[PDB]
Amino acid sequence: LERPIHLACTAGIFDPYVPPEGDARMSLTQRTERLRKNAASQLAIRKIREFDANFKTKDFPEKAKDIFIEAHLCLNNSDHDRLHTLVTEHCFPDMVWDLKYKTVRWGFVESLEPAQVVHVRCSNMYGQVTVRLHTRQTLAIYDRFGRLMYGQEDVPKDVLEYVVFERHLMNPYGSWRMHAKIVPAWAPPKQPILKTLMIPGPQLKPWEEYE
Amino acid sequence: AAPKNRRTIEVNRCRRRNPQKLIKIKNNIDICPECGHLKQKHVLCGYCYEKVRQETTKIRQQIGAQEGGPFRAPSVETMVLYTGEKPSEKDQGKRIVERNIKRPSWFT
């Protein structure tokens, strides 16, 4: 390629922060943990300060929370133009790919507990901030035909998720955009699809025999 | 003799949609008990028959190697044995064909 292909985001998370088992409670501690890992993470904050100089962990959760709410609300209207600004190119296909020919109704109920920055990293240079969000939300997806396939029309369920935001520090026009979500192994399973599924068994030619 | 007039689509539609010219629906189609594939009542299941012949080709292929040439058919009865089987007393003095695979469950 004569012209190098341009990437404003990097697939994956630089260091996948491991949430602590039992973190979903009391809905300090994790506040100390970012302080405890300051050597690994404060240095990343220091570098983020140099290129930004307005990065304060105290106020980022409010802005970080705001992006999360607005980004999902684009799904209802299906305003992809707005959503591209809100989320990175890595995040975009995951959110939107399987929602084609479907309508999603998503709303944000009051947040249970305050959002907190939990882990940040840096690598030309990219900076990723992991945020912890506990909130009650509503979701309902429909077919081409308007039939409900997932979720309950209107009931609030409490959700605890860890969302990674990212920014391209070098670019003058870079911004903080939702990048990925880290799922804890201890997380409870999500609600199942309304319909029932058949998982086909092995298909056998006349030569073969079942085992 | 050549047509005196073009035939209209109204006449033609009556000729080619007459019931005599339609495909008859078949009432003899049934599902096979063993394989679960479709078959006609009076005809052998094609899936099950497919298993039998492909095993037959394997047996016949082994026969060809043993004979080694044309005009070498035995004058004694033939028998097929699968790995883990030995000729019985009644099997004495009969050509034995040896197959690497195990005895098929359906074959006895």
Binding site: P192, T196, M198, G201 | -
Partner: protein, 292 residues
């Protein structure tokens, strides 16, 4: 009035259905594995207490739906329309299986139940017909038997040939309706309430409740008609194709209450009989049947 009993009994039947249907909140997924010879290894991810073996057949193909009369859930016969309760392995039984013993019983019981439904509505509302029992008779006996006690006014009237022909006409009407055999497993209390009036049914319910460790009793409904059952039944009444009410025989030791046994024969659509063969079997179905 008899019409009132149908209404009240139906109301109690519906109330129990809603209570059990409401009893299960949300959707919980149960994995049920196909263990049958055909299409082996398929796993159906179904919803608990809602999906039925017929729904599993729907996934595979229409041949399973049309040809499957019963299901083996964890080695036990299950009604095709009875909601599945837990993760299990499932197998579908047909009339043409090598040993269709369980299928034969279910067909025989269902046909006996259809006999009871016809009898109840056949007679004039003036007379009082009480269903006593449906004796469990082997298929070899040559007919399925339903026992009934008519009013003392008809203590010595016997149906004529036209009367018996009238009964079969009602049975054929029931078949044409194509009514599914609804299923309920209910505790003694509700079953007794639905069948409080009929002393014969009450004692039968007590026996079939003592037998099980709990008080669960099987209830089946065809349209409005409701009855207790010895076990699983046919999915629908459309399975029956040939039906006959052969004869009625008075049980001699019935001076306190004249009990009349109703007899008939049936064959499914899957196993139809030729004209002459059917007649010969019908003639042999007009002879007394002794439960053994």
């Amino acid at each position: 009035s008899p019409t009132e009993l149908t209404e009240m009994r139906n109301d109690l039947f519906n109330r129990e259905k809603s209570r059990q249907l409401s009893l299960t909140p949300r959707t919980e997924k149960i994995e049920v594995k196909h263990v049958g010879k055909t299409d082996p290894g398929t796993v159906f991810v179904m919803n608990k207490n809602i999906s039925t073996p017929y729904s599993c057949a729907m996934h595979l193909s229409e041949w399973y739906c049309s040809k499957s009369i019963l299901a083996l859930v964890d080695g036990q016969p299950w009604d095709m329309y009875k909601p599945l309760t837990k993760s299990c392995e499932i197998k579908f039984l047909t009339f043409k299986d090598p040993d269709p013993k369980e299928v034969n019983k279910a067909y025989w019981r269902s046909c006996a139940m259809m006999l009871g439904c016809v009898i109840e509505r056949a007679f004039k509302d003036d007379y009082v017909v009480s269903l006593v029992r449906a004796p469990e008779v082997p298929v070899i006996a040559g007919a399925f038997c339903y026992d009934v006690t008519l009013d003392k006014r008809l203590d010595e009237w016997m149906p004529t040939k036209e009367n018996l022909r009238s009964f079969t006409k009602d049975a054929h009407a029931l078949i044409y309706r194509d009514l599914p055999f609804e299923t309920l497993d209910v505790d003694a209390r509700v079953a007794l309430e639905i069948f409080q009036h009929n002393k014969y049914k009450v004692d039968f319910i007590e026996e079939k409740a003592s037998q099980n460790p709990e008080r669960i009793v099987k209830l089946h409904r065809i349209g409005d008609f409701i009855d207790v059952s010895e076990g699983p039944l046919i999915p629908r009444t459309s399975v029956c194709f040939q039906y006959e009410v052969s004869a009625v025989h008075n049980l001699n030791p019935s001076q306190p209450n004249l009990i009349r046994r109703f007899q008939g024969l049936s064959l499914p659509t899957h196993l139809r009989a030729q004209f002459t063969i059917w007649d010969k079997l019908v003639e042999r179905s007009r002879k007394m049947v002794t439960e053994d």
